[PDB]
DNA sequence: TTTTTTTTTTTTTCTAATGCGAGCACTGCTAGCAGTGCTCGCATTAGATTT
């Protein structure tokens, strides 16, 4: 191992560097980038330049992953302006400075890193996998569009309950008993089974055959015990003079005793072997019981039979491994092809699909594409790595040129073993790499907790119980030797343990005296914090403890929860940032149901009062009393939830919701109440998920029945219904030792440090192939492998939970007991991480765990007894507060503009089904229809098929359509197919501006002074317009230098033809005030022609209004379904006038 | 193709480990009996993580 300069390490082939915690592995990353960005180093360097997009970065979190990025953007912008500078005040910089040759190139590199910065390949292992996928699918073999699900927990009990479906129905009751005797159903199957179905298979030792069947084995078993049944009947009266003539001291075996075992053993023997249970007075009769109790230098009874009880109760009987072992593969494989068949993937699926695809024959191809787009790539928080992303990291950049790999990472940190992460396989990397770089020097904590550390870890010898992993002492920088935290005028030691009072504590009276201590001593430093006493000081400078600064780290949930409630009790503020739980399962979300419940039918008495009783609306219980007398007041709340309802419809969820605080001083009363903020909080959020579910659903009761859903299944693993942050303000922050990893907290708690626990469970790995091997028996042999790495684990944790803090860090200790007798003896302090390093490995008692404790101290580490903690709660100082109004509006906004249509401002063929739909489909007939050629039967028989219509139709309509096309028209008696392609536009689109607000009265006068039609009609009513007037004309057209306009219209005026005649289309006219209509189509192209015809004149080149009743067009009535009608000049002068000023 | 009624609650782990109490065989002390060493059985209590 070799001291680490960023500059001088050169980027080829593999290269590792380790360090210990906070000696700057994440700071040396930016410095790597920056000489990757530059190619600097000479010898050391790169053989070319790179570029942002060719630079792979993998860190082991998202949030790291997005400091990474913002550091390194940083680093840039400061590196670009001292290249332009020329000078700089940091010490890289500057010998970074002085290693650039040209500088004006260099700033011009940054620059263009800088504008790429968006597209830094800086990911997680998972987001890695997943962008190599998409963007070569096609050598993986995978699909383009791919969709993520980030819980397979359905999917994984469905596939539990199929194969249990399959495999435990069919069953005989006989072997059926067996099973039900392991496990109770797919649910409890499904448990045992979960951690190995996730990540890569484990090897199981000793695997049964492959053929072997369920009744097999239960032969098997039950000729087995059959034989020693057997051999017990043969020998049931022999055993009694054996004993009774060899010497065996009879105290230990009693001659009653011995009668009634051999009753009872008599007894299961003529039983029938139904199933497996053994009566356990054959433990006392086998050889090596015997053999133990026996006279010194007497004879010992020996019998062939005992031999057998003994070589039978070696080893247990049962189906478990087979049943395992079937369902560890049928399972799997059953969630791969589901989820191939959904199109979906995973994490897991992810990784292991890329390593599939790498394996595979293609994926040599595959290689070179992830190994061309990223030449370089940094790894970092190697030590949790998992086999499959070693096998990938390796066949993609081991031996290739001109690729260079840099892995980081520190084994004392690996943590996460539980998620399938491996230390050995981190070994096996370390072995396989020749070159090794180190840091040296603490860069994180004041120099008390370094040497605090490496006193604690220098106790005994191979601390971590790891050959590979050595220990040495570090160093603290020049930087933080000004470090100091002073408590009430006095220094505090650097670690301090707090040990607690007595012989032997149990695990719950430990977790509540620490979680007491812990409280009591953090309203202490925050009381003594408040009046400027308490400061974390760098040399002069200094600064108050804040609620903020101080973070108590926990292993699992329910200890977080027992450490915030004794801290609540306090009445100080604390916050859980592992907190997985989801809204809906408060309180909230159900008086949000029944609020909901109650606006939704007000009419029931029964939800409205239970909506009304509940905790957020505040009332008393007389309030409820009086108001379940009194009619008024319950009639105005009917009222109120009435009026509640129309704006639920209307405006939507979150107006209604408003209205509804607003109007019950909800959110005040909240607030004033001690506590209400939360609750506050979480009506808000609720609020927003219910508004954004709502925009969704149409139904206003649909969104009822989501929220009820939700409520009935909350959904932890989602990320929008995960719990919001109480306030903004200071919080302690209660955050696990895994969430924990890369971060930085002043000040530091570990309540619960020394609590452990023991693995039951046998899965370890082989000492010499480094390969993960499940035991499905218990052989104690494997149970101890995996005890012993259970304990590095809990050592690995410890150091990480220790070396975070920076000024001060307390834990507690106290004399643990695991065992319930022999209290008075050997505690179990020393199987916990901590203790094993404060009793160097040796079991002691109470008095010996003091004195080691005593031992331990020196000038930065002191202890003090933990005693339970004065109940008074923090005393906080109110502030006054200032005169508050908000601003009003003088100016309103105006509506006034607008853009309408006519519709917006109004506001046999006769048998022929009528609609929008059929009359949008006999307009759309017209659009695209040539009227200079015959209709052809083909085409209508298209165009019914395209509505659906009945073909029955297509003879007929076809004549119709001709009926329509050989009309004539107005006295110059046009042809609709004497108009050819040059003559015609039709849906023509206009746009008519409106000046000055359009008056319904100002315009009706004068459309019925001009028009009888509109003096027939009541006036036109509607509101003020201003703005743009849209539209669309049927058709215009042109005959003998002539313009017309002509509008379809399918209307059923009628049932006969007589309500298709002159007298009865101006009445239709006037009932669907068709009038201004037209003439606002007439305005149109009247303006449209003055705009385009150069000397234009009204009366010469307009030729009037044509509205086509097309059932009304009939061959044998000239007049029926057409009319025309021609406005008159000055009432469109006058109308053009006021609709320009 | 016509129509009437009615309002309330119920359940909760399992395995394991020990402490004591009762019974008994052996055996040493002054043939029986008290001590002792032991052992089985019933009741009581503790504990069950981490992206
Ligand atoms: N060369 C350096 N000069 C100045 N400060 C440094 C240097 N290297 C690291 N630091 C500081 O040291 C602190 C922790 O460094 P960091 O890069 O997190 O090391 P680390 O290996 O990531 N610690 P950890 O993630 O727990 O293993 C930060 O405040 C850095 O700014
Ligand atoms: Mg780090």
Not at 132 to 141: P, R, V
Not at 146 to 160: G, M, T
Not at 538 to 558: F, H
Not at 1049 to 1059: P, Q, R
Request: one cysteine or more; glycine letters at 6%.
């Amino acid at each position: 191992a070799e001291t680490l300069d960023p500059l001088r390490l050169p980027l080829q082939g593999e290269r590792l560097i380790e360090a210990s915690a906070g000696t700057g592995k994440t700071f040396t990353i930016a410095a790597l980038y920056l000489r990757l960005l530059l190619g600097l180093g000479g010898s050391a360097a790169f053989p070319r330049p790179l570029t942002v997009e060719e630079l792979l970065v993998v860190t082991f979190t998202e949030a790291a992953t997005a400091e990474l990025r913002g550091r390194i953007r940083s680093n840039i912008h400061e590196l670009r302006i001292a290249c332009l500078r020329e000078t700089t005040d940091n010490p890289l910089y500057e010998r970074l400075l002085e290693e650039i040759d040209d500088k004006a190139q260099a700033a011009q590199w940054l620059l263009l890193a800088e504008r790429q910065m968006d597209e830094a390949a800086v990911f997680t292992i998972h987001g890695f996998c997943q962008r190599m996928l998409n963007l070569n699918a096609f050598e993986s073999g995978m699909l383009f569009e791919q969709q993520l699900i980030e819980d397979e927990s359905l999917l994984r009990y469905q596939a539990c309950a199929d194969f249990w479906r399959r495999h435990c129905y069919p069953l005989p009751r006989e072997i059926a008993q067996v099973v039900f005797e392991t496990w109770k159903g797919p649910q409890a199957l499904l448990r045992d089974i979960n951690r190995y179905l996730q990540g890569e298979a484990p090897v199981i030792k000793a695997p049964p055959p492959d053929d072997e069947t369920l009744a097999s084995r239960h032969a098997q078993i039950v000729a087995r015990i059959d034989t020693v049944k057997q051999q017990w009947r043969d020998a049931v009266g022999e055993l009694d003079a054996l004993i009774e003539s060899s010497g065996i001291d009879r105290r230990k075996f009693n001659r009653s005793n011995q009668a009634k075992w051999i009753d009872k053993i008599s007894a299961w023997a003529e039983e029938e072997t139904n199933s497996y249970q053994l009566p356990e007075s054959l433990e006392k009769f086998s050889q090596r019981f015997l053999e133990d109790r026996t006279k010194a230098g007497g004879e010992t009874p020996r019998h062939p039979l005992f031999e057998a009880i003994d070589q039978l109760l070696a080893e247990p009987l049962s189906i478990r491994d087979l049943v395992i072992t079937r369902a560890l593969a049928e399972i799997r494989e059953t969630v791969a092809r589901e989820k191939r068949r959904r199109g979906e993937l995973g994490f897991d699926d992810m990784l292991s699909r890329l390593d599939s695809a790498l394996r595979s024959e293609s994926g040599e191809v595959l290689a070179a594409a992830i190994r061309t787009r990223f030449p370089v790539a940094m790894i970092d928080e190697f030590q949790d790595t998992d086999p499959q992303q070693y096998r990938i990291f390796r066949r993609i950049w081991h031996h290739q040129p001109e690729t260079a790999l840099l892995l980081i990472g520190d084994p004392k940190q690996a943590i996460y073993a539980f998620r399938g992460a491996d230390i050995f396989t981190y070994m096996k990397a370390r072995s396989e790499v020749h070159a090794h770089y180190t840091l040296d020097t603490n860069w994180r904590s004041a120099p008390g907790m370094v040497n605090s550390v490496n006193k604690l870890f220098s106790q005994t010898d191979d601390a971590f119980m790891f050959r590979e992993i050595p220990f040495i002492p570090v160093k603290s920088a020049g930087k933080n030797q000004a470090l100091r935290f002073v408590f009430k005028g006095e220094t505090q030691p650097a670690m301090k343990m707090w040990l607690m009072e007595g012989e032997s504590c149990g695990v719950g009276d430990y977790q509540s005296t620490m979680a007491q201590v812990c409280a009591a001593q953090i309203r202490d430093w925050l009381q003594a914090g408040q009046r400027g006493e308490a400061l974390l000081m760098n040399g002069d400078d200094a600064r108050p403890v804040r609620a903020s600064d101080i973070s108590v780290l926990v292993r699992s949930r329910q200890e977080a929860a027992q450490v915030r409630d004794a801290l609540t009790l306090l009445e100080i503020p604390s916050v859980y940032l592992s907190n997985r739980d989801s809204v809906f399962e408060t309180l909230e979300a159900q008086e949000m149901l029944w609020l909901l419940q109650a606006v939704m039918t007000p009419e029931r008495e029964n939800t409205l009062r239970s909506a009304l009783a509940t905790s957020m609306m505040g009332l008393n219980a007389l309030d409820i009393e009086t108001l379940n007398n009194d009619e008024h007041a319950w009639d105005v709340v009917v009222e109120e939830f009435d009026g509640y309802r129309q704006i639920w419809r209307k405006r939507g969820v979150m107006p209604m919701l408003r209205a509804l605080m607003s109007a019950r001083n909800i959110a005040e009363n909240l607030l004033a109440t001690a506590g209400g903020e939360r609750r506050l909080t979480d009506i808000l959020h609720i609020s927003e998920l219910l508004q954004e579910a709502g925009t969704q659903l149409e139904s206003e009761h649909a969104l009822v029945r989501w929220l009820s859903q939700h409520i009935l299944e909350p959904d932890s693993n989602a990320s929008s219904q995960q719990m919001r942050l109480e306030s903004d303000k200071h919080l302690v922050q209660i955050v696990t030792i895994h969430k924990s990893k890369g971060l930085e907290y002043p000040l530091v708690w570990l309540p619960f440090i020394t609590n452990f626990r023991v693995q039951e469970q046998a899965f370890y790995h082989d000492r010499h192939s480094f390969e993960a091997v499940l035991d499905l028996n218990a052989a104690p042999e494997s149970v101890d492998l995996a005890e012993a790495e259970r304990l590095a684990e809990d050592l690995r944790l410890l150091y990480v939970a220790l070396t975070r803090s920076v000024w001060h860090c307390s834990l507690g200790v106290a004399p643990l007991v695991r065992r319930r007798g022999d209290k008075k003896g050997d505690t179990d302090v020393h199987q916990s991480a901590l203790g094993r390093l404060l009793q160097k490995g040796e079991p002691q008692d109470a008095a010996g765990l003091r004195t080691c404790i005593e031992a331990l101290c020196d000038d930065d580490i002191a202890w003090q007894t933990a005693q339970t903690g004065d109940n008074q709660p923090w005393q906080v100082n109110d502030v006054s507060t200032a005169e508050l109004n908000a601003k009003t509006l003088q100016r309103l906004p105006g509506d006034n503009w607008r853009v309408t249509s006519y519709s917006g401002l109004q506001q046999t063929p006769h048998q022929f089904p009528r609609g929008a739909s059929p009359g949008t489909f006999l307009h759309s007939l017209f659009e695209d229809l040539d009227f200079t050629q015959p209709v052809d039967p083909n085409w209508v028989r298209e165009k019914l098929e395209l509505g659906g219509f009945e073909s029955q139709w297509e003879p007929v309509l076809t004549e119709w359509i001709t009926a329509v096309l050989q009309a004539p028209l107005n006295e110059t008696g046009v042809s609709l197919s004497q108009l050819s392609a040059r003559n015609k536009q039709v849906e023509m689109e206009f746009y008519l501006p409106i000046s000055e607000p359009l008056i319904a009265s100002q315009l009706d006068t004068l459309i019925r002074q001009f028009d009888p039609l509109s003096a027939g009609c009541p006036p036109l009513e509607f509101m003020q317009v201003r703005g743009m007037l849209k539209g669309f004309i049927d058709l215009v057209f042109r005959h003998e230098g002539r313009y017309y306009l002509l509008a379809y219209k399918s209307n059923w005026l009628g049932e006969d033809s007589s309500a298709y005649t002159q007298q009865a289309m101006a009445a239709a006219m006037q009932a669907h005030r068709y009038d201004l209509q037209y003439q606002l189509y007439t305005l149109a192209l009247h303006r449209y022609l003055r705009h385009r015809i150069a000397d234009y004149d009204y009366e010469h080149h307009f030729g009037g209004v044509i509205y086509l009743f097309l059932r009304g067009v009939d061959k044998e009535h000239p007049q029926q379904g057409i009319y025309t009608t021609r406005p008159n000049a000055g009432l469109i002068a006058l109308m053009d006038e006021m609709f320009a000023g």
